[PDB]
Amino acid sequence: DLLPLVPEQVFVEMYEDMARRQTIEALVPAWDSDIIFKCLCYFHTLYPGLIPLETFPPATIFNFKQKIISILEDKKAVLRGEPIKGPLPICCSKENYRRHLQRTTLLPVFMWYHPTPKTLSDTMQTMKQLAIKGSVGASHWLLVIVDIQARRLVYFDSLYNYVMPPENMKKELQSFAQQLDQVYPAYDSKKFSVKIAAKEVIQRGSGSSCGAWCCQFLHWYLKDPLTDALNDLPVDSVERHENLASFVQACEAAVQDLPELSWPEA
């Protein structure tokens, strides 16, 4: 039997997939902690209810719940004229921080995650290693929105199930939600609800657009806390990211002439 032709193009069978991924990677490069923070400061000017929490160092899977509880307990104190006990931000005066706490209705909690580290310190160490070599690697940004006004926790994973299956995260967040009912109780005894935002992979074809996706979802949520934008997405991976690219470009222009490393006034 005649031998099959083996072409003198080692990668040709992957050309289409490679071209799409290269296109996507070029459209939306990685967003790290500093630009995310600038974007949050900008978002606050548009939506005063959003407190621009610092992403340095970012929360992790090991301490995001403790960080949220500290912030809410401090907000409770501020509304009662009592001392705050939580760690203070670097780029904000303590007085301005108190005013942000008094005003905020929504905590944008960005979590930086990597499969390998098993502790908070290991995670920070991994974060440092990757940063100096300029690699994303297997790291991933996640967003937890604590909507105080609606008593809603929204979990956004652009890779859908990168940390754990969505039902396992649902379970963990549901237990956390009832802890928040005791920590930050409501007059009418309305319970904190939990929403897993992503029903499938949004970030198809990319290893770097996670940061931008989180900020885009947040902005969609800020425009409409009932948004179904994740369902109205284009099917094509490339089209999704060229829409995201316009968002990114608009944001980067919007913050270009905004003050560096400083919170806006509450």
| DSSP letter string, the chain | -PPPP--S-TTGGGHHHHHHHHHHHHHS----HHHHHHHHHHHHHH-TTB-----SSPB-TTTHHHHHHHHHHHHHHHTTT----SPPPSSS-HHHHHHHHHH-SEEEEEEEE-SS--SHHHHHHHHHHHHHTT--TT-EEEEEEEETTTTEEEEE-TTSSSSS-HHHHHHHHHHHHHHHHHHS--TT-PPPEEEE--SS-SSTT-SS-HHHHHHHHHHHHHH-TT--TTTS--SSHHHHHHHHHHHHHHHHHHHTTSPSS-PPP-
Full residue range of the structural domain in which residue 246 is found:
1-266
Sign of CA dihedral 255, 229, 103, 54: negative
The residue among 230, 237, 234, 231 whose CA lies nearest residue 216 is 230
Report the alpha-carbon angle 66-70-73, nearest 5.
135
Number of C-alpha atoms within 13 angstroms, CB side, residue 48? Answer: 5
Give resolution in angstroms. Answer: 2.1
Method of determination used here: X-ray
125 to each of 18, 32, 250, how far by Cα in Å? Answer: 32, 16, 33
Integer Cα distance of 66 and 57 in angstroms? 14
Contact 49, 105 (CB under 8 A): yes
Domain count, the chain: 1
Give the residue from 157, 211, 210 showing the smallest Cα distance to 38: 211
> Contact at 8 Å (CB) between 60 and 109?
no
- Asked if 202 contacts 233 with a C-beta cutoff of 8 angstroms, the reply is yes
- Which of the residues are catalytic? 140, 157, 210
